Amino acid sequence: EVLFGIASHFALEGAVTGIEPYGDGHINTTYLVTTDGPRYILQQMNTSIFPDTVNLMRNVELVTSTLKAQGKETLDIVPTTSGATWAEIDGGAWRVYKFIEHTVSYNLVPNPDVFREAGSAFGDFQNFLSEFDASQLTETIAHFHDTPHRFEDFKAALAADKLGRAAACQPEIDFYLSHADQYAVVMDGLRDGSIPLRVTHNDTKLNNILMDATTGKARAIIDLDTIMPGSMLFDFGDSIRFGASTALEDEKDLSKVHFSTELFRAYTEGFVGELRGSITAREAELLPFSGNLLTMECGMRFLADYLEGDIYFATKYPEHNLVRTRTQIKLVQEMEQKASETRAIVADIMEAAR
Numbered sequence: 001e002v003l004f005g006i007a008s009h010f011a012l013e014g015a016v017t018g019i020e021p022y023g024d025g026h027i028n029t030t031y032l033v034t035t036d037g038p039r040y041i042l043q044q045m046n047t048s049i050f051p052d053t054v055n056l057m058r059n060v061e062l063v064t065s066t067l068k069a070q071g072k073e074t075l076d077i078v079p080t081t082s083g084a085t086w087a088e089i090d091g092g093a094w095r096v097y098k099f100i101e102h103t104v105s106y107n108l109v110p111n112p113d114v115f116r117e118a119g120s121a122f123g124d125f126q127n128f129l130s131e132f133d134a135s136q137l138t139e140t141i142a143h144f145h146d147t148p149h150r151f152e153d154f155k156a157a158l159a160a161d162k163l164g165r166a167a168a169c170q171p172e173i174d175f176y177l178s179h180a181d182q183y184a185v186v187m188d189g190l191r192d193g194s195i196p197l198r199v200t201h202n203d204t205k206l207n208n209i210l211m212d213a214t215t216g217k218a219r220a221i222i223d224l225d226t227i228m229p230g231s232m233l234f235d236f237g238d239s240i241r242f243g244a245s246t247a248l249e250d251e252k253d254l255s256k257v258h259f260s261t262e263l264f265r266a267y268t269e270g271f272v273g274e275l276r277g278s279i280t281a282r283e284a285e286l287l288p289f290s291g292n293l294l295t296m297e298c299g300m301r302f303l304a305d306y307l308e309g310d311i312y313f314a315t316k317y318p319e320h321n322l323v324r325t326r327t328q329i330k331l332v333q334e335m336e337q338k339a340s341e342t343r344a345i346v347a348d349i350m351e352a353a354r
Helices: 001-006 053-069 112-128 147-160 172-176 185-191 233-243 261-275 280-285 287-307 320-337 337-354
Strands: 015-019 029-037 040-044 086-088 092-099 197-200 210-211 218-221 229-230
Touching: 001 015, 001 040, 040 197, 053 261, 112 197, 112 218, 112 233, 112 261, 147 172, 147 185, 147 280, 172 287, 172 320, 185 287, 197 233, 229 233, 233 261, 233 287, 261 337, 280 287, 280 337, 287 320, 287 337, 320 337
Parallel strands: none
Antiparallel strands: 015 029, 029 040, 040 092, 086 092, 197 229, 210 218
């Protein structure tokens, strides 16, 4: 009823004939708009998590404009009748994207072939943003993949030990404390130039990768809300984290959790295969370690939350964040033990892409 009124705020190119809820997404509230013609995505943005709508949308407008300029499929913002990229409607923030037709998306990594395609999709994304000045982008979530900053947060949670949970998870604590010298590797490289500042997506889960409904080839990267400056190692590393595991983040059975070199190679094949002309030598040699770093970063965040009474991630039971942190530890250790195999894989893929 009011959804129709909202829709009237935007310069749609067909008469609206329907509006209903759409998607698996958690953070935004998404609606599908049917018209006598093209279809649209209408979103009410999360203003609690993303209070600075102007900066968020500016980031999106900059990145999507650059991709469109080059003829790349991306989120196409449908302006308001007054020409803005989003509209304020009763304290609520709303925006419209053209509906990307004829796609499918995956929730979990179904096999290596689809993972390789995820890799190519983000390698492509990076390739065509290779000349975009990433420093124009504002840091929508401060210090998001600044691992030394996360570790400080973790040490604060540990020192406070408000629930007295520390006593129950010393080996997990000691794991994070003992890896302290490794957390600053990529931030240091960004600061001293050895690592290129690039666009980072920061939510590289497959449900944000649209692939063609018929060919299964990557079509577009969506959900651009967490676009920020950073290293592409932050995105690659996190994709490895969740995607190259044989199990879920919260798998209780640790014998069921492994770092798969087969998935690592697949993602790397697609990614480097699209990014070979741009990726630096420093970046390439840090590909395997980026997996370590972002898994440790995610792992310490889970443990910090457990120690803080689970105030950041949703939980379903009391030891949930602890079970999550333990999968991340198990994965990092297998990453450390397979460093030989992973360095070889990268070197081989780097020459194959030539």
